[PDB]
Coordinates of C-alpha atoms in Angstrom, one line a residue:
Chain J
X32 CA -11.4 2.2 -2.3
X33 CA -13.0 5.5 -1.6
X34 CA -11.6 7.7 1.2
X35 CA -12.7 7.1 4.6
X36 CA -13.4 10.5 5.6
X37 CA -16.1 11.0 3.2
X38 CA -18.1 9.7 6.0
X39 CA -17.3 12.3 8.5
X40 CA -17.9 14.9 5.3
X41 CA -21.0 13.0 4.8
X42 CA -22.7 13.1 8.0
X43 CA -21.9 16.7 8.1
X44 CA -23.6 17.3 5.0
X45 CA -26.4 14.8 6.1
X46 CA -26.9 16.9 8.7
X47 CA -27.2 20.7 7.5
X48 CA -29.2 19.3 5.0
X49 CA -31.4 16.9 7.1
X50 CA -31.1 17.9 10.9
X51 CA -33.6 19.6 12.7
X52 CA -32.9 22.2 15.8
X53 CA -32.4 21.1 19.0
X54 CA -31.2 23.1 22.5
X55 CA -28.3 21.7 24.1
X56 CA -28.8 21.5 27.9
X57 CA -27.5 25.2 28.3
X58 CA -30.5 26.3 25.8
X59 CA -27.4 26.6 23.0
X60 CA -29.2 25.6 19.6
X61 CA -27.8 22.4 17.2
X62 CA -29.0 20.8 13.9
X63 CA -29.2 17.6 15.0
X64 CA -30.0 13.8 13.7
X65 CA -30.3 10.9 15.9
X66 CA -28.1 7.6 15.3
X67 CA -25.2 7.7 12.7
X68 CA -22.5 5.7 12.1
X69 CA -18.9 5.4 9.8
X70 CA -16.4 3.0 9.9
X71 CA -12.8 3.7 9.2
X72 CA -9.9 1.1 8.5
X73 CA -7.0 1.3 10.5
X74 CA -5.2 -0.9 8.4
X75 CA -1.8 1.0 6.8
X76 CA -3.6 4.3 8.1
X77 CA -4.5 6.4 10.3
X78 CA -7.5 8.5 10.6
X79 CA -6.5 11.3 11.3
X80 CA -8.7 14.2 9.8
X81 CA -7.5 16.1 6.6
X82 CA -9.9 18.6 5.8
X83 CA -8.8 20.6 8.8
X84 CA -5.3 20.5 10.8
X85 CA -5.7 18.4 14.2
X86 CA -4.4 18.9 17.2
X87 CA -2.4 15.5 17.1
X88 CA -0.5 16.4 20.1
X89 CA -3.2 17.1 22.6
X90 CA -4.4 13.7 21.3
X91 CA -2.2 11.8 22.3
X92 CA -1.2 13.9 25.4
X93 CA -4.8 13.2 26.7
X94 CA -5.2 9.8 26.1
X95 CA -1.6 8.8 28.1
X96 CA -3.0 11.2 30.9
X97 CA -6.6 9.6 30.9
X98 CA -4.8 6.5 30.9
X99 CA -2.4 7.0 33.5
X100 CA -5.7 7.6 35.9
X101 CA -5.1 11.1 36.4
X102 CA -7.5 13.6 38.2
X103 CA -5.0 16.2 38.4
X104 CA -5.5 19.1 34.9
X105 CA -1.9 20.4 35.5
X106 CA -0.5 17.1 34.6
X107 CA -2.0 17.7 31.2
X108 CA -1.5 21.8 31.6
X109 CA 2.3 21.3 32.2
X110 CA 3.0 18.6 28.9
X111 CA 1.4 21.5 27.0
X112 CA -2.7 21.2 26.0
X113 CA -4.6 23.5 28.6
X114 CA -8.5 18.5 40.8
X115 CA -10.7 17.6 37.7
X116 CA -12.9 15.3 40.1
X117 CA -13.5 11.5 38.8
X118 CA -13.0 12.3 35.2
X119 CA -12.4 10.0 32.2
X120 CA -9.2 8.3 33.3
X121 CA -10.0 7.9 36.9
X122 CA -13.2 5.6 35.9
X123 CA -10.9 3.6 33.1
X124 CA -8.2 2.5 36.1
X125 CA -10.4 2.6 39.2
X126 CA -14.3 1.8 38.2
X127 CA -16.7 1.6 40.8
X128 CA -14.4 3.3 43.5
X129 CA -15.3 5.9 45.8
X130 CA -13.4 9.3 44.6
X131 CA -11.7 11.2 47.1
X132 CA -8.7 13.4 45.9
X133 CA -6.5 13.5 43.1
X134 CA -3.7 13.2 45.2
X135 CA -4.9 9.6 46.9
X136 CA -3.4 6.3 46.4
X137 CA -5.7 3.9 44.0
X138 CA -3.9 1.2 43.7
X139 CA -6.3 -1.8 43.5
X140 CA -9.1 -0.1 44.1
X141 CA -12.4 -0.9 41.4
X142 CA -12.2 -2.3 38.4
X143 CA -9.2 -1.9 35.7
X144 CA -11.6 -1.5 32.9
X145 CA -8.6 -0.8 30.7
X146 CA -6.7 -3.8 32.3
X147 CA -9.6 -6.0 31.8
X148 CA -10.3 -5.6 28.3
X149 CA -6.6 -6.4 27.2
X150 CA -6.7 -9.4 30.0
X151 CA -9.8 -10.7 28.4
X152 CA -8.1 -10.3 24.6
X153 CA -5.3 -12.1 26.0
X154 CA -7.3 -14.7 27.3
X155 CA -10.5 -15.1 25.1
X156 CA -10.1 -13.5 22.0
X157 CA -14.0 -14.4 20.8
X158 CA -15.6 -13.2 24.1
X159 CA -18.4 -10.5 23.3
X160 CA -17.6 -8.8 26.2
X161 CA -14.7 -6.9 25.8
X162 CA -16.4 -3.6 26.6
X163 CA -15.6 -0.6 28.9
X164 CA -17.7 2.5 29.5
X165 CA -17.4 6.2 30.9
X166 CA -19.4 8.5 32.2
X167 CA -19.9 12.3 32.5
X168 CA -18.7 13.1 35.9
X169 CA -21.5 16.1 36.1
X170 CA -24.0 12.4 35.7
X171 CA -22.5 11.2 39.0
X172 CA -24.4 13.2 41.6
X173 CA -27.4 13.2 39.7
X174 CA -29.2 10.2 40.1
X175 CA -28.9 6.9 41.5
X176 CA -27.0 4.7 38.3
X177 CA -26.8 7.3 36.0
X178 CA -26.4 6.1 32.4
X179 CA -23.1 6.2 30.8
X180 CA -21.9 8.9 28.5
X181 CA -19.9 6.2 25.8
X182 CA -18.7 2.8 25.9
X183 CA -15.7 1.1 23.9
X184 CA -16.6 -2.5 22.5
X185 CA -13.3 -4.2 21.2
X186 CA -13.7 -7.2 18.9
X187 CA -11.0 -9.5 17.5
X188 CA -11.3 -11.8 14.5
X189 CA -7.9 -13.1 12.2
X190 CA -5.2 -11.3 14.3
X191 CA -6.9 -8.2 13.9
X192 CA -8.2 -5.5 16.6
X193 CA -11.5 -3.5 16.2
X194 CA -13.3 -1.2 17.8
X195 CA -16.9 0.5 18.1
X196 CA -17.3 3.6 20.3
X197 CA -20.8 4.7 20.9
X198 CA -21.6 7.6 22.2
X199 CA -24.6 8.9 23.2
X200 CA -24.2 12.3 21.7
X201 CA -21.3 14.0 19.2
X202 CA -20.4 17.4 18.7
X203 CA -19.5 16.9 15.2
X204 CA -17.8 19.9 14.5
X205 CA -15.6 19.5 17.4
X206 CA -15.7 16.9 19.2
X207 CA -15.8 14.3 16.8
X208 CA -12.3 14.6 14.5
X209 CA -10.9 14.5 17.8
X210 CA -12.4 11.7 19.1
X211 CA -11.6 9.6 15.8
X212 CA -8.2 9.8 16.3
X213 CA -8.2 9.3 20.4
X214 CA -10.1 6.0 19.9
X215 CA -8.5 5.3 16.9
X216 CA -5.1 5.7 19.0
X217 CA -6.5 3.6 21.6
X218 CA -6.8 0.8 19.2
X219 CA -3.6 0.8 18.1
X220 CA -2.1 0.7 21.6
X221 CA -4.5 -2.0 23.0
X222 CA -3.8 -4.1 19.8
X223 CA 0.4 -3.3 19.7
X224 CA 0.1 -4.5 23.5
X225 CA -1.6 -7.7 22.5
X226 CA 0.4 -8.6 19.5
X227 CA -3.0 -7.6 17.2
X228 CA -3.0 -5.6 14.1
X229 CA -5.4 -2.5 14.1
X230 CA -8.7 -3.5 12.3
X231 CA -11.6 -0.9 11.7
X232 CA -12.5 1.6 14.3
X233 CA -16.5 2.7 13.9
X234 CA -17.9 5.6 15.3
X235 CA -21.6 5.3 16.3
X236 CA -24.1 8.0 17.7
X237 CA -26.6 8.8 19.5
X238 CA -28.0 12.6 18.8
X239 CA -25.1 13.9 16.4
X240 CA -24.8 17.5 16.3
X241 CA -24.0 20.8 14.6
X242 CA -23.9 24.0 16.9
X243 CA -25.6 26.6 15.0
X244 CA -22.0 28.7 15.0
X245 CA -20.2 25.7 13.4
X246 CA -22.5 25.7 10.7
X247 CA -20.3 28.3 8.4
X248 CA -17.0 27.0 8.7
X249 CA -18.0 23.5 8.4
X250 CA -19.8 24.9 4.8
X251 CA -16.3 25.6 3.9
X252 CA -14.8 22.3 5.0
X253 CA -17.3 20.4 3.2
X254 CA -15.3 22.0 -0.5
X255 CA -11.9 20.5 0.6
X256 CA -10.0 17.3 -0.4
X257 CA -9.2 14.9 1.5
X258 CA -5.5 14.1 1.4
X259 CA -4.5 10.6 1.8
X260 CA -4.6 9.7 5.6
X261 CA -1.3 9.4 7.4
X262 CA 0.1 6.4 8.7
X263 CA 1.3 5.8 12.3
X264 CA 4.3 4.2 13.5
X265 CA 4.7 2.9 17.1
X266 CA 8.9 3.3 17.3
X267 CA 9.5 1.0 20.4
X268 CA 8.2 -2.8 21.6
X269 CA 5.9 -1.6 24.3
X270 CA 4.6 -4.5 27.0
X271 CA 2.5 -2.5 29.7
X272 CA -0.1 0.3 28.5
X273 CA 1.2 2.1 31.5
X274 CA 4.5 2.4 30.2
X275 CA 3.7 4.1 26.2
X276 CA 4.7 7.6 26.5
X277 CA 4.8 10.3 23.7
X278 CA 7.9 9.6 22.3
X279 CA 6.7 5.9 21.2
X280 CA 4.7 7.3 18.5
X281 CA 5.3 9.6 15.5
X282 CA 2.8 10.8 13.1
X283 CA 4.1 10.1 9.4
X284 CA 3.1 11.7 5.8
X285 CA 0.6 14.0 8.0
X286 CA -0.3 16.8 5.0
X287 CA -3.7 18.5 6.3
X288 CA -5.7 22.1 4.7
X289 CA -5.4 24.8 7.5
X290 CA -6.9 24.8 10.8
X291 CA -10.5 25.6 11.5
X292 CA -11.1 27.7 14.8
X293 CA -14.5 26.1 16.0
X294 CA -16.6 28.2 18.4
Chain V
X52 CA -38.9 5.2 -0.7
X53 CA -36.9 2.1 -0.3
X54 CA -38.3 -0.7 1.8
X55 CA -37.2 -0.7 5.2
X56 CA -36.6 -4.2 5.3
X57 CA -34.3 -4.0 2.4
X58 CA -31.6 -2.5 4.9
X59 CA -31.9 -5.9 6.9
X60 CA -31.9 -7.9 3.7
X61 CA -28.3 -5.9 2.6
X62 CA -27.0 -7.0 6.0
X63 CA -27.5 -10.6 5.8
X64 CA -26.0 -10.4 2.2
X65 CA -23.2 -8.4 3.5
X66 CA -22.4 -11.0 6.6
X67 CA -22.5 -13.7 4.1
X68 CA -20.4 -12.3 1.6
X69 CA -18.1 -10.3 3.5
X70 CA -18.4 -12.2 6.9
X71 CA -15.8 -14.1 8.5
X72 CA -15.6 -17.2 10.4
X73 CA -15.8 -17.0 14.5
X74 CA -16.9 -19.3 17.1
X75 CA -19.4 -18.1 19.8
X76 CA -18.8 -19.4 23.2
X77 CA -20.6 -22.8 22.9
X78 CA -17.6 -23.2 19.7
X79 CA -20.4 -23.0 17.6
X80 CA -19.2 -21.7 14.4
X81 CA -20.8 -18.0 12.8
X82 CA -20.2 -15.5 9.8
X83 CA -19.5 -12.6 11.9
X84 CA -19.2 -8.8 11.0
X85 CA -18.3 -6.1 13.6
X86 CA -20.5 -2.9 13.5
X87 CA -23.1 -2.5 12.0
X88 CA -26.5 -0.7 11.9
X89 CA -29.8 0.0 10.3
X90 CA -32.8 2.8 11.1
X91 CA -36.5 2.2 10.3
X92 CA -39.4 4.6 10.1
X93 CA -41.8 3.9 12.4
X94 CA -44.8 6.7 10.8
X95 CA -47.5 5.4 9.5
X96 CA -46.1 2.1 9.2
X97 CA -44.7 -0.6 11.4
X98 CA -41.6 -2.8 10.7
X99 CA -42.7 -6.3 11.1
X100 CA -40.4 -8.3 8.7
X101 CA -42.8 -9.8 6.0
X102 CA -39.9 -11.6 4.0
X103 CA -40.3 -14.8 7.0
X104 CA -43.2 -14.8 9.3
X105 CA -42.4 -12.7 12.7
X106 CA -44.2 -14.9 15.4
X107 CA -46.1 -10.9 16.3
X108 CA -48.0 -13.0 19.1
X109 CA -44.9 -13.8 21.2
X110 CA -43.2 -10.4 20.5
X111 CA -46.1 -8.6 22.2
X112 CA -46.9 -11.5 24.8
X113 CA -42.6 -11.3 26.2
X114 CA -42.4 -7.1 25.7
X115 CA -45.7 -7.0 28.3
X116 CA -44.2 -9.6 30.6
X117 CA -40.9 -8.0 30.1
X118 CA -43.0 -4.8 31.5
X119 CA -44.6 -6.3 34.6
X120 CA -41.3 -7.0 35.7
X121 CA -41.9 -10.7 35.9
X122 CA -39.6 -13.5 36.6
X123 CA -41.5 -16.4 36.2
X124 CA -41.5 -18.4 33.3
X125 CA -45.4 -19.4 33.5
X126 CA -46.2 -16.1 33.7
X127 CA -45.0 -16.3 29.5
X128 CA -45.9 -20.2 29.3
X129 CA -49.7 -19.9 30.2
X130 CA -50.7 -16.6 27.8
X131 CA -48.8 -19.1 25.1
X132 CA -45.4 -18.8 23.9
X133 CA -42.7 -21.2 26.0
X134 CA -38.0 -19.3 37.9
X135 CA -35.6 -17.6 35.5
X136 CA -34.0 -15.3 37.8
X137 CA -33.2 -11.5 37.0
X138 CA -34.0 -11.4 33.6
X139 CA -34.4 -8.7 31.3
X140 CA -38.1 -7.4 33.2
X141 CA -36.5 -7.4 36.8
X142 CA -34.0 -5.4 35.5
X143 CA -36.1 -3.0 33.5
X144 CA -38.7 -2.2 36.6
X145 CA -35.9 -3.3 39.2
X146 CA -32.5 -2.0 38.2
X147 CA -29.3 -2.8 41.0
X148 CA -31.8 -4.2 43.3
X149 CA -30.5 -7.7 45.2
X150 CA -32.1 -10.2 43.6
X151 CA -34.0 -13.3 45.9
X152 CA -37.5 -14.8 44.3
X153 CA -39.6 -14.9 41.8
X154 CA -42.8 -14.5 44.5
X155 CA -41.0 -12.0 46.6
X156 CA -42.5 -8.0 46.9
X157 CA -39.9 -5.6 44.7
X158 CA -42.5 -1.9 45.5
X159 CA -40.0 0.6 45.4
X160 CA -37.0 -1.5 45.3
X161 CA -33.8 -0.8 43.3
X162 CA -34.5 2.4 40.0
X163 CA -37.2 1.9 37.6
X164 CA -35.4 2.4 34.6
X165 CA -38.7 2.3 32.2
X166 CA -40.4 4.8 34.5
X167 CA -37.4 6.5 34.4
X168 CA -37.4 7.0 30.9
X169 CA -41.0 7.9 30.3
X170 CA -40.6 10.9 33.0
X171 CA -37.6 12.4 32.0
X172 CA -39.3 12.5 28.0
X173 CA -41.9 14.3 30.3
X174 CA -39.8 16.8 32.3
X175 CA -37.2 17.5 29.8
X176 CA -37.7 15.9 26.1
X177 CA -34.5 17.0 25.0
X178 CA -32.1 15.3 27.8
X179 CA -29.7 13.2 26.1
X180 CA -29.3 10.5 29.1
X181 CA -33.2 8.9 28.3
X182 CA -30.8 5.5 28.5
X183 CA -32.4 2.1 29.9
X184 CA -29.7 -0.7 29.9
X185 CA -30.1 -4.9 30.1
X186 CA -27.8 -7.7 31.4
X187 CA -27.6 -11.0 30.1
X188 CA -28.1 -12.9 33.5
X189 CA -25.7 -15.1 33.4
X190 CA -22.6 -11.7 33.4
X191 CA -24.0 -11.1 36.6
X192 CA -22.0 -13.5 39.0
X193 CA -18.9 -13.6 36.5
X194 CA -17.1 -10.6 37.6
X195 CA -17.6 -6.9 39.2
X196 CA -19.4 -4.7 37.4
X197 CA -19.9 -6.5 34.4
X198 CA -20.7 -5.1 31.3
X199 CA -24.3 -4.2 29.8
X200 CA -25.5 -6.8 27.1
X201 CA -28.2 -3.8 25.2
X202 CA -29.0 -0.4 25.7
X203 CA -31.9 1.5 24.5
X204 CA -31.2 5.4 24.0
X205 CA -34.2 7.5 23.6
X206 CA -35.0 10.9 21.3
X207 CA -37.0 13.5 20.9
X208 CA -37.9 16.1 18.6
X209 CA -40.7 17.9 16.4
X210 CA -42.8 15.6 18.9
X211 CA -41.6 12.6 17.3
X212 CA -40.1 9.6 19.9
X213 CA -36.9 7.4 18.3
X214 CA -35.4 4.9 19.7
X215 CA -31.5 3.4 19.5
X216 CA -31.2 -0.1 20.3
X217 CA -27.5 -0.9 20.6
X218 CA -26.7 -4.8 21.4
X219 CA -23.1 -6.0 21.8
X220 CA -24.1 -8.8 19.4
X221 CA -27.2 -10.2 17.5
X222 CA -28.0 -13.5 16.2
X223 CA -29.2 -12.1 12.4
X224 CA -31.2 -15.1 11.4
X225 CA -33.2 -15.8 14.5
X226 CA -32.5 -13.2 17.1
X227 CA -32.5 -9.8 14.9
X228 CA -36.0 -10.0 13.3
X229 CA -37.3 -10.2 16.4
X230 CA -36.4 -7.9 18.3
X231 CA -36.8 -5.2 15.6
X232 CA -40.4 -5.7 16.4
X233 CA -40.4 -6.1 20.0
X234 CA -37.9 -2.9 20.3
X235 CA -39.9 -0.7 17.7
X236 CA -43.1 -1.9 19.6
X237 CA -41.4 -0.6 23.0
X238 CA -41.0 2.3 20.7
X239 CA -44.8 2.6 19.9
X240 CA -45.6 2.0 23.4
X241 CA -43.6 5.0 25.0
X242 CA -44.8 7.0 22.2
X243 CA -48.4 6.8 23.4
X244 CA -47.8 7.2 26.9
X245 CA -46.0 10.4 26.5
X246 CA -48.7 11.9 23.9
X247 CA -45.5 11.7 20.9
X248 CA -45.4 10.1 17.5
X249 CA -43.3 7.0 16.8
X250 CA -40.1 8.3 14.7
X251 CA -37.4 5.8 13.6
X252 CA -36.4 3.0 15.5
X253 CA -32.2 2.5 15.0
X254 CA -30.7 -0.5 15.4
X255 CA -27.0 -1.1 16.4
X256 CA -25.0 -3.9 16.5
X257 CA -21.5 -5.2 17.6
X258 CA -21.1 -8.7 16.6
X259 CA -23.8 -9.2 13.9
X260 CA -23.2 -13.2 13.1
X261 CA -25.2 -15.8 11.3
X262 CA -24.7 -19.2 13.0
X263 CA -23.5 -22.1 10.0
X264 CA -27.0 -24.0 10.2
X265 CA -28.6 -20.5 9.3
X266 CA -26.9 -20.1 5.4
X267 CA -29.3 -21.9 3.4
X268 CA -32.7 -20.5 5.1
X269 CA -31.4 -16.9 5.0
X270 CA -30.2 -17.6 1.2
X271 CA -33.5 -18.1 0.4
X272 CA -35.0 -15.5 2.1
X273 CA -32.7 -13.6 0.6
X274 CA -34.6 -13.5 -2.8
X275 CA -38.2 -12.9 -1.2
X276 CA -39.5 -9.4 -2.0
X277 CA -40.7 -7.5 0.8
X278 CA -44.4 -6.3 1.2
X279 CA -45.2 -3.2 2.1
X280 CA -45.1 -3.3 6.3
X281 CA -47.8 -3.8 8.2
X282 CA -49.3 -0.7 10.4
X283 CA -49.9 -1.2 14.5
X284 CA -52.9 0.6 16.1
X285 CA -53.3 1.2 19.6
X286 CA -57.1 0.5 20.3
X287 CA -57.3 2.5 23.8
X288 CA -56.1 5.5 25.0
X289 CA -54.1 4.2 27.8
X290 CA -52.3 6.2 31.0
X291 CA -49.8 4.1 32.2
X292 CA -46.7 1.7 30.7
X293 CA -48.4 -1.1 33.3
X294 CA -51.6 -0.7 32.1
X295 CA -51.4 -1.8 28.4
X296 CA -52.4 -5.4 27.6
X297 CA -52.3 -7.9 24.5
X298 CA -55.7 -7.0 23.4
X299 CA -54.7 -3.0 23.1
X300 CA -53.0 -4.0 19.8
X301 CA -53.9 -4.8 16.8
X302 CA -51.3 -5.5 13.9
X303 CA -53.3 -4.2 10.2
X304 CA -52.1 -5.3 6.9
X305 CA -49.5 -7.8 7.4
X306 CA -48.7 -9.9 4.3
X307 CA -45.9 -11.8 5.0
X308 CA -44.1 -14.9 2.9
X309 CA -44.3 -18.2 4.6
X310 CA -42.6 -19.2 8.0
X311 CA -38.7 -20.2 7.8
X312 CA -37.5 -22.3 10.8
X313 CA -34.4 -21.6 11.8
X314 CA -32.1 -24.1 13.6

């Protein structure tokens, strides 16, 4: 079977050659195409880019942090990645719920998104439902029901787990890589948790996007190889998704080309 | 360039070779694949699917009634096409508002998503939150904060207007051809409004299933060529998203092969 990051390759060369330019809200110029979309296994793999080294460990650092519920950036600061207000984690534990600090006691307070999509997998494996969201916090103040920034659909058919992130715009020389493996790490906790194995994970988009000074080095990641993607292995029976912590997981046969500096 | 509809036609053949079994919530039985998703031009020609006839008459007749806002189901019955509470209209026009009748005043009442939409591709074209979202109705007493059954995402650029259409899950045989056309004709309508040209209309999917009793009609269709796809000309200029009517449209060209009842 053919490698699934010739996708991510793919849409990158899809878009120098076919994107048009487009300003970013801070008048910062893109190539840009609107709706893409690549679907990569998770079965005896884990997509975790090649062509470039990736930060694996901030990975994995944010996602326990957003998932833990944190507002507080020195709780990620101090583990090692460098009041946040009601970012990404606060909105997965506590939807709905009027933010105050980052100090304050949630407990009970809106929805468990998180909670609810492994409770509904738990309880009705078939439901079409299965769907959190998030939003950008800067979105918030705006205007009355803002739209959301990205939602997570989960899906489950023969013991397996999937998931489909949209989101309404990707950064694709940054933001994306990264976001393949948080998502695709989210997957394999919600389905180790639920006694699932990981299925496909697929990446859709809105407006996907090159910044103009991403173009160059992306040029020279479009010549590289992909090496066969590495596997991950969880290392200890986990019940709660509050209780994974680093340690659980190790990276294994992860042999990457050298880092690109974006930006 | 390839047919449009041939995208739609790989899909079906994809579900029914690759799909696999899973019940909806009835326990009626489908082929179901997670994630999919197709993108069809919308210059010059319009993508009304020619290898069935697409009842055009009742695509048009729901997407106006959908735009009033309506909630009455002889509002749809008596222009020809057979109390429903807040379906996908009163959400559109009357997003978060407290739903009581059918007869009662909404002016101003909860945010006009549709509105919404059309001024922000006004005031800032390239905003990437031009995002109207629907609810199937019966989500709404289930549980807090339940989530979205479709959203629409909205683009622009090179005065061109596209349009995402993301839906948690569609019903391939009867429910997909459909709303290709009604989506692409919201498409066309938002288009003229805001002085751009239709671009490609992108459609997204979750669940994409086939229900059993569907196999043999889509089979067949299957080996129908397409014709080339019809064109759509607006016949006024027209100010306002409430002002269009049927008779604004006219559908040119459209060839298809006979009717195929499904169900």
């Amino acid at each position: 079977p053919p490698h699934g990051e010739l996708q991510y390759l793919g849409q990158i060369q899809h878009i120098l050659r076919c994107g048009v330019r487009k300003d970013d809200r801070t008048g910062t110029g893109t190539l840009s195409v609107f709706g893409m979309q690549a679907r990569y296994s998770l079965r005896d793999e884990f997509p975790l880019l090649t062509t470039k080294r990736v930060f694996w460990k901030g990975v994995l650092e944010e996602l326990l942090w957003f998932i833990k519920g944190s507002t507080n950036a020195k709780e990620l600061s101090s583990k090692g990645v460098k009041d946040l207000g009601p970012v990404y984690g606060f909105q997965w534990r506590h939807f709905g719920a009027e933010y105050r600090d980052m100090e304050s006691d949630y407990s009970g307070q809106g929805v468990d998104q998180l909670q609810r999509v492994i409770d509904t997998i738990k309880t009705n494996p078939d439901d079409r439902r299965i769907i959190m969201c998030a939003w950008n916090p800067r979105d918030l103040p705006l205007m009355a029901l803002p739209p959301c920034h990205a939602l997570c659909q989960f899906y489950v058919v023969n013991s397996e787990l999937s998931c489909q992130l949209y989101q309404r715009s990707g950064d694709m020389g940054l933001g994306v890589p990264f976001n393949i493996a948080s998502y695709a790490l989210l997957t394999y906790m919600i389905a180790h948790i639920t006694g699932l194995k990981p299925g496909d994970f697929i990446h859709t988009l809105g407006d996907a996007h090159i910044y103009l000074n991403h173009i160059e080095p992306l040029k020279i990641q479009l010549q590289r190889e992909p090496r066969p993607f590495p596997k991950l292995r969880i290392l200890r029976k986990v019940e709660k998704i509050d209780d994974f912590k680093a340690e659980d997981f190790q990276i294994e046969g992860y042999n990457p080309h050298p880092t690109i500096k974006m930006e």
